[PDB]
Design a protein around this ligand. Structure first.
Ligand SMILES: Nc1nc2c(ncn2[C@@H]2O[C@H](COP(=O)(O)O)[C@@H](O)[C@H]2O)c(=O)[nH]1
Ligand SMILES: Nc1nc2c(ncn2[C@@H]2O[C@H](COP(=O)(O)O)[C@@H](O)[C@H]2O)c(=O)[nH]1
Ligand SMILES: Nc1nc2c(ncn2[C@@H]2O[C@H](COP(=O)(O)O)[C@@H](O)[C@H]2O)c(=O)[nH]1
Ligand SMILES: Nc1nc2c(ncn2[C@@H]2O[C@H](COP(=O)(O)O)[C@@H](O)[C@H]2O)c(=O)[nH]1
Lengths: 468, 440, 473, 447
């Protein structure tokens, strides 16, 4: 990483304190840029969904992995539900997406609430595995909530065999009144659905898959209790990647945790803790971790800096840690504090292999949390921090709970036009691809190497138009 | 103190300009760190309440000291009063708390207790938030037993049947978290303050008789002739009590005050709370830079430094201790509590708050009464907001202590002296401080 | 009923336009008043839950019936659901209340939402049919919403055999950590739940029960299609009372419906249509209806007045309709426009045998509508009008999609309103406590020992302008 | 009472539904009017403070009693509390008021909070009884106790401060007298008991044993007994009145609440000299929204006053008093006195603690008596308990004391008498002409 001549700040740098300078560019198009990651995570786009209960569900795992990202399941989640989630995800189709399925005896109230858990804007009425019709949000408006799918379903829908060409079903949905096409297995059961926009993304994004060509999914583990036994179970569960997570990454308990999991020789890539320094970055990798997660305080749910005063500007933290991981033959995850696509690109420019996106994605449809509204009828979802699950560890529950970090809350409002998380992946990946062409990079490794950066003042960040 | 490479600033640093960098730590939890102070104040937690009248009352002195802090009492208080408040505070129970009570809301909000006891000749006739329908318990009861029995108010009774006090749910919890700050006799610690005007020897000597466990000789400008002579006067009597002195932001002044016989040096000028001096004078200095310099200067002579002024957040408390301060003094943030002398008022939004007032001229140096009175520093005021749920100071003490304890685990210190020794700090930009979630 | 001398207004009266004048009373307390009804509804208190999808569920049915009220199931509800609802309600205990069930593997998100489906404020965790833990409203706070119930539910709770006297469970709960008392059958299975207030109400309210001692429940029918077959089907489905309902009750299609149902001899009480006039009350009773439901326009979800201009002030409507019904030996249900207990008492003082309550009860926990939270995050629920289900249509059988859309254009749309829960006490039983407390007082103010005496002994007067503004909201 | 010719409405009338028609008057000034009450209550002005925990304290009872009003202490208060409250009121001077006590060691903020407990706007800093000075709003003027308020008035004119610290002959203070406080001494005449000091009343419920409670209250110093219940026409009231009267306590007996002449007769024939009148107009009364039972207060006072006077009785107008017009209209309706509710809770002397508003204007909290006005064992009756209603009455930013409201009230009534030509309240009732108005009629003028 290099800075413009004359720029050597007297302070550590945030994402807002820096900018990228366009260099000479031989790259013709944005689609000529390969966004695939070299860190062994398997992500074809530089996006990792943070491990948070308010963020990473089974639905988020499906939709993101199909678009090339990866979703880390939250820690302290029962092994039975972990194994059930990963089986759900790895059973998903790579092109078509799993819709919200309904039964004809369900209430329109339930139908309307379940519709918003996915970005399709329509639900499929099913009998046994086999679609009998479609329910649209427009048809649920103005009707009786407790009338059960009486006259709702149109029963006439454009349908195509599973594994058809996304460009043909794209054409099939051109003259169709509804934008959803149901896709069926050769036996007649429902394979899934594909939106006209979904067919487009299939040609753009490369799904993140295992050797079987099954959607990738990861899971997180705390350093409390027996870490080796816990990590062993999640490995057998089919988790493609393991994340050892705690608030303070540089610690005695953390290093012993990596050694405990690595002593089992699970052959899985190990992500380790949170450290903003090179010395911590060096110790975690030496402990047997392949990748290190980096930050303290940038998280939107993180009150650490206002409480403890501990923390560090994320850009400088990523820059320093990526340097330490590179020399030790490893990689760095930029973790927390990504509001805008700029923060993603700047993190990669800092040398991070992958960026971990938090509560920003809690404001989508596929988010596990329930969709709420305002008096203004503006859609939003409430995001929460992982809280105690990120820390180290009846009368005791109230006492220790007194000094313990309280779970933080913030309102993430949905985009009233496009609320799906894939739409956010459009904004993120489009921005980064332009960052690559501005610098002239054909891929991520070239980006970090060729990038020229500079520092700005407060008036510098105010330049330009704020996004929607 | 250690700084990052290239982080030597072109400006002086406030609490907002800096951050603490994590390091290798063998300390697992917040309960494994010792918050006790080595400055000889007697506090089990590094928190001192300011000598403003708008903050430190009898209720404030009782509440904080019980949780391990200490409250220095305002100057311009008749010694008859400081004696009774000391007598009041030192007569308190270390576990049970004194309820607000009157003969058969503004009074109910004077304490963090959810209820008030109605009393007749010492014996409770029951509660206002109803005779035998609430829970009682004799004094000497373990807090865990009171906690269990409340599964949020439990009236504690003296063996004769009268009212000894009250213990709430969190109050029962907190008996086993905080170690009370007590003198040799096991009574809650309390301190007093004096101006440098008039006779300081007799004032200080008289306060030592009033039961003050610590003496504060306080003035607006710490570095000057009248202060040095004043410290010399107090130390000459050799009362044996800890001496903190004045306010100075310079390394030399910190030493000058110590050489005069003061053990501790209060440090800061102008960030303040009710202080208009920066906008009035322009005199002052960023608090972190000030403390870091003064703390280092005192440690060389074996002295200690109280970080004084400009503490909004638990962040500022940890940073001051990391700056080398043995204790921190919090003026205004505790005016925003229940235990503050000012009653509870509300405003436009349903959120509560309290009005804080400044010392001003009281920290400074019939024709002369009006003429010198015209230049009095006017009506310092501001709005400190309560936490809409928990308005008690002990809840702010939870925050403060929870943060600092966690700071130590981050740096890897097992105590406060190790915090300053093991800490690495760096400078941040505007957007740097904006990182993370704010506090409620 | 008679009015104070000099009061003969030139306009018809609403609930806000009138007041009850106190009179000499030998009645000491409100508890000595008999709230039982003479209309044959079987209700021990003068409240009927309106037939609307936003108010009357399976939970509203048992909760109100246990306290002596009755719930009318909405018309055009699938009979499969009615029979399912009837069987559920009539299988409920007269004392013990049906609790909210959770699993050890359930999410706190699911736990907290299901928790508000009842007024218990607590939810029982079950293992193999046998209760283990208990989840409280307060017990979910500051916890990860997706955490399991194992580390949540507290297994220390008071217990007691099913069929225990309500007075004992009350004293058992005084020293208890939690307000709820879990009821267990001797075999160990979960019988149900009884709260402290639930124990108190057992000594106050007397359940409305059928011939076999099972909680009473009603059902409604529109006059479109085959009414005889629908009514016959609901009667065999276990409905203890039948309600024939439409917007305009004074029209021939309604008259034929009553005659059709009454010709089947179900041996059940008949409520018929909605009429604001004395002539309508007679004609419906002369059509074979035992009871006459009364109002046009006072309904909270009703747009009739703003659309058509048709309607009548509810008080003046009830006083006239009740009087005409008594002469025919029938009874009148006051239907629509009840904001306050005042409207319930005035309706009875007007001569109504029973008071039908709508969207007000949609603002409770037991309401079938899902619980929502606003800006201030205070609890509320949405109420909806029955719309076209209350209207009359021609035969739509074998229609055209054009005709289906044609008739749908002028069709009445569903109106909506936000009904706020009381943040402290959000159950419908708390409104029943509110309503019955007010009506019982009116009886003592008038000096009536029961509802029939109230109508007889009541003196009324008219007010205007500042008259309504007196008192506190 | 005779309404204007042609006015015979189809409804009963509230205070806002009526207006007084002026008539020929030989009455020159307001001070020539006699506001005295003929009901034998002992009030020199037609003002009775309602019995509620939100309004009548010991401080409220002192302040209005020296201005001629009377306080009815809320019922179901401990006999230990009423005695101490009475002992306080009976310990008060007739002329000079009681100051707010301070001390050199107290704070600036606490001094201001304690200051609002009185309308003095000033507090006396005292040392072991000896006043050392004063604090005024944002040294002292001293005069001996029982001086001429007209002389003290003059001393305060030459003073920078408007309050006078009154020093007892041996040293130290009996109390304080303001300029306005000295003026009112020439206006208002204190209501006194048989012992020559401030008069006070007490309320009792009809539940339990009334006679024993009334006996206890009477020996506890209550000069007037009030038998109070939501519905006064019930039989348990007849028992209550006849019970208390049989004790021969020699005190004025006011009873219950009735809006009807039939109720007024029965209670009077039961031995009640005065009948308190209303159902529902009360600011804290939710009865009308709950029960539906009630009646417009003006029509209630009209019919009941006529029935009472026929039996040689009297009528207290109870509830619905907002503006001074309501007081005058009640007396014009034939009431011997007017009972004032939560309106006074919006003063300084109210026991309710003072809060601050969004606009940073003073307001106080008022609350209802609820079940105390009504007719395991506690829990069953506690579930049907009528919730205590809550309303917020805002103080006048300028004059926040209750004496200031008394100035308003007594000014309006004295002015009402001059319009009709009455020299007193009995003449007010006989000489008054009334009329009916619409919503637009009441909206005329400056609120
Ligand atoms: N200290 C703390 N960090 C959190 C908490 N919740 C999430 N985080 C961190 O913040 C990251 C995402 O933050 P975001 O991208 O929403 O700003 C997570 O991957 C995790 O490292 C929390 O409750 N406390
Ligand atoms: N400079 C100055 N400092 C003051 C004044 N009044 C109080 N202080 C000091 O302000 C400190 C509190 O500041 P805080 O820590 O609340 O920001 C106390 O230690 C107190 O001595 C003042 O008027 N001027
Ligand atoms: N016109 C009309 N009246 C309705 C509708 N829904 C309910 N109602 C009437 O309103 C009554 C309930 O009114 P509520 O008690 O909620 O104010 C019902 O019993 C019925 O008489 C509707 O959709 N349209
Ligand atoms: N029913 C009832 N009446 C009340 C209550 N509180 C006060 N009142 C009545 O209302 C009167 C107050 O009148 P106002 O506040 O309108 O001037 C009281 O004197 C009393 O008669 C209450 O809580 N319930």
């Amino acid at each position: 990483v290099r800075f413009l001549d004359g720029h050597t700040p007297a302070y550590d740098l945030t994402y807002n304190d820096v900018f990228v300078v366009p260099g000479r560019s031989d790259v013709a198009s944005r689609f000529d840029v390969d966004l695939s990651t070299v860190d062994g995570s398997g992500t074809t786009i530089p996006v990792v969904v943070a491990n948070m209960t308010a963020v990473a569900g089974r639905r988020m795992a499906e939709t993101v992995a199909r678009r090339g990202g990866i979703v880390v399941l939250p820690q302290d989640l029962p092994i039975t539900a972990v194994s059930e989630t990963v089986d759900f995800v790895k059973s998903r189709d790579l092109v078509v997406d799993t819709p919200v399925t309904l039964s004809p005896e369900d209430s329109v109230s339930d139908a309307n609430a379940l519709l918003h858990k996915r970005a399709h804007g329509a639900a499929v009425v099913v009998f046994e595995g086999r679609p009998i019709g479609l329910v649209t949000e427009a048809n649920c408006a103005g009707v009786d909530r407790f009338a059960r799918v009486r006259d709702i379903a149109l029963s006439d829908f454009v349908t195509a065999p599973v594994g058809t060409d996304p460009r043909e079903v794209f054409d099939l949905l051109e003259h169709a009144p509804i934008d959803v096409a149901v896709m069926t297995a050769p036996d007649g059961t429902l394979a899934g659905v594909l939106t006209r926009t979904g067919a487009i993304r299939a040609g753009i994004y490369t799904p993140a898959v295992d050797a079987k060509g099954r959607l990738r999914i990861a899971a997180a583990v705390g350093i409390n209790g027996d870490v080796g036994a816990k990590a062993q179970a999640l490995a057998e569960a089919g988790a493609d990647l393991l994340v050892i997570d705690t608030a303070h990454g540089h610690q005695a308990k953390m290093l012993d945790a990596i050694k405990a999991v690595a002593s089992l020789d699970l052959g899985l890539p190990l992500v380790a803790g949170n450290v903003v320094s090179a010395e911590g970055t060096r110790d975690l990798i030496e402990a047997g971790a392949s990748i290190v997660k980096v930050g303290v305080g940038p998280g939107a749910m993180c009150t650490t800096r206002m409480m403890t005063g501990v923390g560090r500007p994320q850009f400088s933290a990523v820059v320093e840690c990526a340097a330490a991981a590179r020399q030790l033959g490893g990689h760095v995850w930029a973790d927390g504090g990504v509001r805008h696509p700029r923060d993603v690109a700047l993190a990669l420019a800092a040398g991070a292999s992958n960026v971990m996106i938090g509560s920003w994605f809690a404001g989508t449809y596929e988010s596990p949390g329930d969709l709420l509204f305002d008096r203004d009828d503006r859609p939003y979802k409430e995001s929460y921090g992982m809280a105690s699950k990120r820390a180290v560890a009846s009368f005791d529950r109230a006492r220790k709970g007194l000094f313990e970090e309280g779970i933080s809350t913030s309102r993430m409002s949905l985009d009233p036009a496009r609320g799906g998380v894939e739409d956010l992946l459009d904004h993120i990946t489009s921005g980064v691809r332009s960052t690559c062409t501005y610098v002239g990079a054909a891929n991520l490794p070239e980006l970090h190497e060729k990038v020229v950066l500079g520092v700005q003042s407060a008036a510098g960040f105010a330049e330009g138009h704020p996004l929607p």
